[PDB]
């Protein structure tokens, strides 16, 4: 059910990944899919059948809408200590003539509404949008550069944003964070700050079909509800997009399967990443061309009055890795504790990560960390 959406969103990530060279990407495979599924309702004929193709389901089919809702339900959040924050929002022109019985049916499936603004008066289409995000992402995301391209002929526009911050089952002691030589892909080397902790961690070694090994490692968040999975190659010449483009929702499950809980000295770099994505090409790469075309976009289920096309569609993600929120050594956490010499695991190469909703296997975040 929810693996379908995640895996779709992975595909979305692949497209951006390959376009973004050796650059910091962060992305939400849930985020992307949760709005496309929405926009699915608001489309017709081949425009729809295009995006249902890519996704692999009809939000229209039985139980399928309930699912997402109920997922969203969990994410926010009595256990979620202002840690995540989602939003999905579609906007359209204020004064328009929509089909009879749709916007209610749409509320029925998603329980949200489709937001109606005035694009003619551009100054505060922009504000309105950048402050929808602002409100729903607890201010952690405010601006949104891609909205610049909003004009007055711009009439249908789609947004998705999430801000995630840690809160580890086992946090790193602040005491022990030291600057450390990270090596970038090209060759160079940067003195980045890297937190260290000697605990017990779920680990496994994975190899792709092509003889590429990575260290896979799970760092769970409090109550084990969310996990982050880091994945870094043995030797530094191995491309990430070697794994990244066989990545999958049941791939992640494959890792947790092979994991055993082992005592290791983990060394890992703090980082803070924010990517805004223009979804057009990515989505068009998947064969979703119709939605952005003036003449050909079928939005008749919500439209009636025509044409009506997606001018702009965007995602803005922000992940933060440190140790949760200012908190720092309670002192609960501490550097070594028990005094054996353990196998180190150092993360000075570029790697990638995934954040997961372990109960449902839903893939919430993703990224290449090419340099902190």
């Amino acid at each position: 059910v929810a693996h379908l959406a995640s895996d779709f969103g992975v595909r979305v990530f692949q497209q951006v990944a390959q376009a973004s060279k050796d650059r910091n990407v962060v992305f939400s495979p849930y985020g992307v899919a949760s709005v496309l599924a929405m926009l699915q309702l608001t489309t017709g004929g081949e425009t729809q059948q295009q995006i249902q193709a890519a996704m692999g389901f009809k939000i229209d089919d039985k139980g399928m809408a309930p699912a997402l809702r109920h997922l969203y339900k969990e994410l926010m959040g009595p256990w979620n200590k202002d840690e995540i924050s989602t939003t999905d929002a579609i906007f359209v022109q204020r004064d328009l003539k929509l089909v009879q019985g749709f916007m209610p049916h749409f509320f029925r499936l998603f329980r949200s509404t489709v937001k109606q603004v005035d694009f003619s008066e551009v100054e505060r289409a922009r504000f309105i949008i950048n402050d929808w995000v602002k409100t729903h992402t607890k201010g952690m995301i405010s601006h949104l550069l891609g909205t610049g391209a909003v004009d007055q002929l711009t009439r249908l526009v789609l947004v998705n944003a999430l801000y995630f911050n840690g809160q580890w089952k086992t946090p790193f002691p602040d005491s022990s964070t030291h600057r450390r030589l990270f090596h970038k892909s090209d060759g160079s080397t940067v003195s980045v700050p890297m937190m260290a902790q000697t605990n017990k961690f779920n680990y496994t070694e994975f190899t792709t079909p092509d003889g590429h090994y990575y260290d896979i490692l799970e760092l769970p968040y409090h109550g084990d509800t969310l996990s982050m999975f880091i994945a870094a190659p043995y030797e530094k010449e191995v491309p990430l997009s070697a794994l990244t483009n066989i990545l999958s929702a049941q791939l992640i499950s494959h890792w947790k399967g092979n994991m055993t809980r082992l005592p290791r000295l983990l060394v890992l770099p703090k980082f803070s990443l924010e990517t805004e994505v223009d979804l057009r090409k990515p989505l068009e790469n998947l064969g979703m061309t119709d939605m952005f075309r003036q003449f050909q976009a079928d939005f008749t289920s919500l439209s009636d009055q025509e044409p009506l096309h997606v001018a702009l569609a965007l995602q803005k993600v922000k992940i933060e890795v440190n140790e949760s929120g200012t908190v720092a050594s309670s002192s609960t956490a501490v550097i070594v504790s028990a005094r054996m010499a353990p196998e180190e695991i150092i993360i000075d190469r570029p790697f990638l990560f995934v954040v997961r909703h372990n109960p449902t296997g839903t893939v919430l975040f993703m990224g290449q960390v090419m340099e902190p």
Partner: protein, 251 residues
């Protein structure tokens, strides 16, 4: 070993190094300290083996000053077998003690010399006077954050804290049992302040104190919130609680 000073194995001839073979690469990496109590046996810490290597992966090295240079008169052993305490707790480190039997032919493994010799096990009726000074030895890190482990054996001196000062109150809320024992450096702290403590990689090593004018094994390095902190003692395995056990696990 945080604080203290480098050493000669001859000053601590029961200290052993324990090595574990890698898992992709050829070769061993340093694992734990160990203590020669009988010719063919060594004590160590339980938690050294949380990752349950088969014995054949383990090598013990007696009589060696440098952790990676072979000593001239050293004595190297393949482990025949090892016995982790049945009720070692992998979260509180309660019952932290192991027994390694050395693989040899002839019921006679290590042999005495100026650099390899067994240390006396304490008498069961041993109760030492509080703040008694004891020593300890290890190849471990010099400070909690040091990238690498020691290039050479170090020694340290600490004093046995009294029971009242070995509760978890004095260990930042952490379980402490009648099987554990805290020693630490009771001098004035700075910093600077190089408070003698063991560190990462010293676990399994000995804590030896004078009694009857006889160097006698009192504790086994175990845990701490290391290394060398604010009158936060280093925790040890009370060796006396395990005398019957040890006996009963050599048959």
């Amino acid at each position: 070993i945080k604080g203290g000073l480098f050493a000669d194995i001859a000053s601590h001839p029961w200290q052993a190094a324990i090595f574990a073979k890698h898992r992709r690469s050829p070769g061993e990496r340093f694992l734990c300290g160990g203590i020669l109590i009988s010719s063919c046996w060594i004590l160590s810490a339980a938690h050294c083996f949380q990752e349950r290597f088969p014995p054949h992966h383990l090598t013990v090295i007696l009589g060696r000053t440098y952790r990676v240079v072979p000593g001239e008169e050293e004595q190297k052993f393949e482990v025949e077998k090892y016995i982790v305490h049945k009720e070692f707790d992998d979260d509180t480190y309660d019952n932290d003690i192991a027994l390694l039997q050395l693989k040899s032919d002839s019921s006679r493994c290590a042999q005495e010399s100026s650099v390899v010799r067994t240390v006396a096990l304490p008498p069961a009726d041993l109760q030492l006077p509080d703040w008694t000074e004891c020593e300890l030895s290890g190849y471990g890190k010099h400070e909690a954050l040091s990238p690498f482990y020691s290039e050479r054996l170090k020694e340290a001196h600490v004093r046995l804290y009294p029971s009242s000062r070995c509760t978890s109150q004095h260990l930042l809320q952490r379980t402490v049992t009648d099987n554990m024992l805290c020693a630490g450096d009771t001098r004035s702290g700075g910093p600077q302040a190089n408070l003698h403590d063991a560190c990462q990689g010293d676990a399994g090593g000995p804590l030896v104190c004078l009694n009857d004018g006889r160097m006698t094994l009192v504790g086994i390095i175990s845990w701490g919130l290391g290394c060398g902190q604010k009158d936060v003692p280093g925790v040890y395995t009370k060796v006396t609680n395990y005398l019957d056990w040890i006996r009963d696990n050599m048959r």
